[PDB]
Ligand binder design. Structure first.
Ligand SMILES: C=C1/C(=C\C=C2/CCC[C@]3(C)[C@@H]([C@H](C)CC#C[Si](C)(C)C(C)(C)C)CC[C@@H]23)C[C@@H](O)C[C@@H]1O
Lengths: 10, 239
């Protein structure tokens, strides 16, 4: 879940 | 009667974080799907919002202590405040003269009518525009604008936060900075803290209405297909 947010959050 | 060393440092890194994530040249806007003036403006404004979400995530990662929250809390904070922080940060392009958001060319000047052509009803727009003018009239110092965005982002009363005590403590420290700054540094600011904290209450209500409108878009695939992956993840209801 929240694949892009995790990535963006480094 | 004087901000501490620790206060002025918080302010400096907040200001810098903002300058690094808000580009007054708006030259990146030419990369969005172009604006069209059915829902002609939803492609371009979906890209505007998606791009701004990334900038807000970038700002958040530089707020003192945000990065040391759990990734779950970071997401919970971001999923519930993104739209409010976008509304706040957009005040920097809003013009009382035009009653619009003016971002460089006349092609990235967004009128009220531009936003109705992305789906919005005047029951979201009327208070959104009213909110930009009262905030613009507040004539905030840059330091204050950035404090307010950080305080908004660090609200512990959001659906899904876990380490509630720790987020409140962060947000408390930022409020104390904001009050001290206004007292020491802002001539005639005795009423200003209260006005700003009311603007946070206004943002909640804007959040509510806006999130209702999002729901009605996202339930029609012909419109939700025009959104971006970041937008759907952030405004979506996944936990
Ligand atoms: C975004 C910024 C700027 C302007 C902000 C604007 C003008 C366009 C319409 C927007 C975006 C509103 C609109 C209601 C937001 C929404 C929604 Si919505 C989930 C139903 C949809 C349409 C799918 C995105 C909220 C803020 C409004 C420019 C600059 O100052 C950078 C800043 O960052």
């Amino acid at each position: 879940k929240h694949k892009i947010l995790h990535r963006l959050l480094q | 009667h004087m901000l501490s060393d620790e206060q002025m440092q918080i302010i400096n890194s907040l200001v810098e974080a903002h300058h690094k994530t808000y580009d007054d040249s708006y030259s990146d806007f030419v990369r969005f799907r172009p604006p069209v003036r059915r829902l002609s403006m939803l492609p371009h404004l979906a890209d505007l919002v998606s791009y701004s979400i990334q900038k807000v995530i970038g700002f958040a990662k530089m707020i003192p202590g945000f990065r040391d929250l759990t990734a779950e809390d970071q997401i919970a904070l971001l999923k519930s405040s993104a739209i409010e922080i976008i509304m706040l940060r957009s005040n920097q392009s809003f013009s009382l003269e035009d009653m619009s958001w003016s971002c460089g060319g006349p092609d990235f000047k967004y009128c009220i009518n531009d936003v109705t052509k992305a789906g919005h009803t005047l029951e979201l727009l009327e208070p959104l525009v009213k909110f930009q003018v009262g905030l613009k009239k507040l004539k905030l110092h840059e330091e204050e604008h950035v404090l307010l965005m950080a305080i908004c982002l660090l609200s512990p009363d959001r659906p899904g936060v876990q380490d509630h005590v720790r987020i409140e403590a962060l947000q408390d420290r930022l409020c104390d900075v904001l009050q001290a700054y206004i007292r020491i540094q802002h001539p005639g600011g005795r009423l200003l803290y209260a006005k700003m904290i009311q603007k946070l209450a206004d943002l909640r209500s804007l959040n509510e209405e806006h999130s209702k409108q999002y729901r009605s878009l996202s339930f029609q695939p012909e419109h939700s297909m025009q959104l971006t992956p970041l937008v759907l993840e952030v405004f979506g209801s996944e936990v």
